[PDB]
Swiss-Prot record, chains A, B:
Changing residue 49 to A: Does not affect ability to cleave and inactivate human TRMT1. The chain holds residues 3264 to 3568 of 4405 of the full protein. This is 3C-like proteinase nsp5. The lineage of its organism: Viruses, Riboviria, Orthornavirae, Pisuviricota, Pisoniviricetes. Residues 1-305 form the Peptidase C30 domain. Residues 1-305 are cytoplasmic. It comes from the Viruses. 3CL-PRO exists as monomer and homodimer. Only the homodimer shows catalytic activity. Interacts with host FBXO22; this interaction promotes the proteasomal degradation of nsp5. It is found in: Host cytoplasm; Host Golgi apparatus; Host nucleus. Signal peptide: none annotated. Inhibited by pyridone-containing alpha-ketoamides compounds 13a and 13b. In turn, alpha-ketoamide 13b (tert-butyl (1-((S)-1-(((S)-4-(benzylamino)-3,4-dioxo-1-((S)-2-oxopyrrolidin-3-yl)butan-2-yl)amino)-3-cyclopropyl-1-oxopropan-2-yl)-2-oxo-1,2-dihydropyridin-3-yl)carbamate) inhibits SARS-CoV-2 replication in human lung cells. Inhibited ex vivo by michael acceptor inhibitor N3. Inhibited ex vivo by compound 11a and 11b. The active site is at residues 41, 145. There is a cross-link at residues 5, 90 (Glycyl lysine isopeptide (Lys-Gly) (interchain with G-Cter in ubiquitin)). Coiled coil: none annotated.
Length: 305, 305
């Protein structure tokens, strides 16, 4: 038993991280087969970032301007193109450490692991959520750009995120591996605002189920509620509306615990109206929303890779 | 910026995890050079665990009774011995994925990463502390035994922990890689109690420094205090006494922020006497004690591996 915010084992992604330099800008790339993927703002100076014309800036750049280094090994660049906000650098060598992989665009509220990297070298791994407002609350220092988010199924890595930006508010924004930003963000040093950051209700419920399984049951009350009643309280606390799809995803957790989803909603409701009275759930004084129902099921069943 | 509970990248340890079976018991081993390290209770039945004589149980076992499997590859066992609570199985093949490594016995309050494993396969990685009472609050399902804790410096893995037990209280106990338990625990299914679980004061202070660096400063107050005064409040809140060694370790953080250690102690004092009034620090409603000063410095300087 016990319950931890666990990341996926990062080894499969470690083998893919490289260093990309263009003039005096260095950041992280991802080397899969004979293609290196990186933030297009690798071509930018600090001044360029105020108002970049990426097409005009990239037109000054040849294959030989892109210095791609994997460990001590320099890679030969035989082609470059811009897909949305990423550059694809064709190298003459397939990465021999290339895992089975997919590119996927995740939905707000889904979780993934980030391998935080500097100069193509891994520093650490953490689990996080894509916030409903398509920001992530990360740990990214100067040079972390091109660090990637992923999920692992068996032996297959699903890349879902590449770090591009810290907003003036200190939250993190980036792209899928086709270079489309999550949210309305652009790769420009201008004032950009995220929406209201709502709580991922389905994830809070999954975590309350996790708590019951591990013997934290104090918050279980004598009450029930309805979806409409629950959602009236949810809207007031900036919780995402709960849908029947959400109730369905929680079914296996409801089945294991013998607690109906709406009974657990009534629990949540009272926690929202009464707070925690200085009590904790699974060592937290806050309602945790960075575990999906899939994550909670995974950690109780013990899926390996 | 931003601040996350990050684990070390787990790839170097992934390559070392194997499956060890003896009769009907399976758990995780660690394959370094031509030696596999695992919990000695691999030789035990559920009934044996009530009151094992490990010497007498091991005497029934030959090299051929120890089935060691690394991926699909079966390893040939050419020797076995018991060192304290671990078995060392000599195999005829050096692990080609053996990283540079050390065995170290860590001190209460130090942090490390766990690669949670089932049947020699990695499931996830998380960062935790060795509690002052030499327990860890992990996530360990049936079969996680022999999962290991480590730290990484550059390219060297320091193995510090092997999972052996869940206590009846649901906290986790285990050994260094010489098979000496952290704490008074034994590898027997009998009632065992941990001491009072105190808070790691030096780690809470390091994390308050982390918070200031990231612009969470609300808890900074107009007051200062003394080591003796601080420690009188500490003893009352089941905080570890702060020593001058602790003050010295916090020096570089004091230097970066321009906040004297004792001013930060006065901050902590008021948080302890007044709680957080429903406020948060770095997204937590509790004082976090699983970051060392070394961890906080690492995450602000961006050390890679
Ligand atoms: Na970019
Ligand atoms: Na990465
Ligand atoms: Na984004
Ligand atoms: Na043991
Ligand atoms: Na492990
Ligand atoms: Na222990
Ligand atoms: Zn950047
Ligand atoms: Zn065991």
């Amino acid at each position: 038993s016990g319950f931890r915010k666990m990341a996926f084992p990062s080894g499969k992604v470690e083998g893919c991280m490289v260093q990309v330099t263009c003039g005096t800008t260095t950041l992280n790339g991802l080397w899969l087969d004979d293609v290196v993927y990186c933030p297009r703002h690798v071509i930018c100076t600090s001044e360029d970032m105020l108002n970049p014309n990426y097409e005009d800036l990239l037109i000054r750049k040849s294959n030989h301007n892109f210095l791609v280094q994997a460990g001590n090994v320099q890679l030969r660049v035989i082609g470059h193109s811009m897909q949305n906000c990423v550059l694809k650098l064709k190298v003459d060598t397939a990465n021999p450490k290339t895992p089975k992989y997919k590119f996927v665009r995740i939905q707000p509220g889904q979780t993934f692991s980030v391998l935080a990297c500097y100069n193509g070298s891994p520093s650490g791994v953490y689990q996080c959520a894509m916030r409903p407002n398509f920001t992530i609350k990360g740990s990214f220092l100067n040079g972390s750009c091109g660090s990637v988010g992923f999920n692992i199924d068996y032996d297959c890595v699903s890349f879902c995120y590449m770090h591009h930006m810290e907003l003036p508010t200190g939250v993190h924004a980036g792209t899928d591996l086709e270079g489309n930003f999550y949210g309305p963000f652009v790769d420009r040093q201008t004032a950009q605002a995220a929406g209201t950051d709502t709580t991922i209700t389905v994830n809070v419920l999954a975590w309350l189920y996790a708590a019951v399984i591990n013997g934290d049951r104090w918050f279980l009350n004598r009450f029930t509620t309805t979806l409409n009643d629950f959602n009236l309280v949810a809207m007031k606390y900036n919780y995402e509306p709960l849908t029947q799809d959400h109730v369905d995803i929680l079914g296996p957790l409801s089945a294991q615990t013998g607690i109906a989803v709406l009974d657990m909603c009534a629990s949540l409701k009272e926690l929202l109206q009464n707070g925690m009275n200085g009590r904790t759930i699974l060592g937290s004084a806050l309602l945790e929303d960075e575990f999906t129902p899939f994550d909670v099921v995974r950690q109780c069943s013990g899926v390996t890779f």
